[PDB]
Swiss-Prot record:
Catalytic reaction list: Hydrolysis of proteins with specificity similar to that of pepsin A, prefers hydrophobic residues at P1 and P1', but does not cleave 14-Ala-|-Leu-15 in the B chain of insulin or Z-Glu-Tyr. Clots milk
Superkingdom of origin organism: Eukaryota
Disulfide bond in keyword set: yes
Name of protein: Endothiapepsin
Source organism of this protein record: Cryphonectria parasitica (Chestnut blight fungus)
Protein family: Belongs to the peptidase A1 family.
Stretches assigned to the Peptidase A1 domain: 17-328
Residues of the full protein shown: 90 to 419 of 419
Lineage: Eukaryota, Fungi, Dikarya, Ascomycota, Pezizomycotina
Disulfide bonds: C255-C290
One annotated GO biological process: proteolysis
EC category: hydrolase
Keyword Disulfide bond: yes
A GO MF label: aspartic-type endopeptidase activity
Gene (UniProt): EAPA
UniProt-listed Enzyme Commission number(s): 3.4.23.22
Length: 330
């Protein structure tokens, strides 16, 4: 089997991407944030505290003839940005782009943090990291990909995120028309539960490539590119007027700037992030100070190849017995 679904930016800045997912019988379609940095499929629901729902589409398990309460199971997750959610668990039929899993754990939110409430466009998350990170207790549950994998034509999914445009998540096949050149594969460590890999270095604009190992995670659920302070300082030094602002919470730059590109290494290959991808717009409405898309990972404890990096590539998440990651230009 295979599946193919379009993923759409939630706003004009590509702050996140949502992908329609069918849950239950008859189908209830929710727009979920596909997150290769986490491993829970959770949704706003009929059980979510009423005051914490503001415009989201909810899953109502009582209206699904295939929903079953997973007795005694609860979940609770806290993300790196400080957001959180928790609740109980159903199993139900879940389909993405024509690919169907029966008996998928659907984690129904009883509580969500304010940041989720305040964003009407995201109805929940669909985790695509390794199932070892799944928070369901007392019986850990598998991701949608983990459940689908044996049925897939090939044990892979691909992320093809658009810049200011829709893109695609495919399951079970590699669309050879969706990238240019060849796909370069690189080793993955699953020891922290992430798609963790080591970049071979970077360049800023037209500058020379610096060969240096940068361990980090391929994370579709993080908006920006978080890298070591040395690397980030080297990038922003090429932008007149750019500075790190403790009050704003990162590097900002004059909105009048034309940003340089940023290149990262994948083995001997190179992925170029155009300068425009690094502009996240005014820090507040009407401001001429703009927020940068490359930020320091110092204090996070891990480097994160988020959407800013991934959207510059066609990315293969290879879930073979020894997982790997592939990157191609596009």
């Amino acid at each position: 089997s295979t599946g193919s679904a379009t993923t759409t930016p939630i706003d004009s800045l590509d702050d996140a991407y949502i992908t329609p997912v069918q849950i239950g019988t008859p189908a209830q379609t929710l727009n979920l944030d596909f997150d290769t940095g986490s491993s829970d499929l959770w949704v706003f629901s009929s059980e979510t505290t009423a005051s914490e729902v503001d415009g989201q589409t909810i899953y109502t398990p009582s209206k699904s003839t295939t929903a079953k309460l997973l007795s005694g199971a609860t979940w609770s997750i806290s993300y790196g940005d400080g957001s959180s959610s928790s609740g109980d668990v159903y199993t139900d039929t879940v389909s993405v782009g024509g690919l169907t899993v029966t008996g998928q754990a659907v984690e129904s939110a009883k509580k969500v943090s304010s940041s989720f409430t305040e964003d009407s466009t995201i109805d929940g998350l669909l985790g695509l990291a390794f199932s070892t990170l799944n928070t369901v207790s007392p019986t850990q549950q598998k991701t949608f990909f983990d459940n689908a994998k044996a049925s897939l034509d090939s044990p892979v999914f691909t992320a093809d995120l658009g810049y200011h445009a829709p893109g695609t998540y495919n399951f079970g096949f590699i669309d050879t028309t969706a990238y240019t050149g060849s796909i370069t594969y690189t080793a993955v460590s699953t020891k922290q539960g992430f798609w963790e890999w080591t970049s071979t270095g970077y360049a800023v604009g037209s500058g020379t490539f610096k060969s240096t190992s940068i361990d980090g995670i391929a994370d579709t659920g993080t908006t920006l590119l978080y890298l070591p302070a040395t690397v980030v300082s080297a990038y922003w030094a090429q932008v007149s007027g750019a500075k790190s602002s403790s009050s704003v919470g990162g590097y900002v730059f004059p909105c009048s700037a034309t940003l340089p590109s940023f290149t990262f290494g994948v083995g001997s290959a190179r992925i170029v992030i155009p300068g425009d991808y690094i502009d996240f717009g005014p820090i507040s409405t009407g401001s001429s100070s703009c927020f940068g898309g490359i930020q320091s990972s110092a204090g996070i404890g891990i480097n994160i190849f988020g959407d800013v990096a991934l959207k510059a590539a066609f990315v293969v998440f290879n879930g073979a017995t020894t997982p790997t990651l592939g990157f191609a230009s596009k």
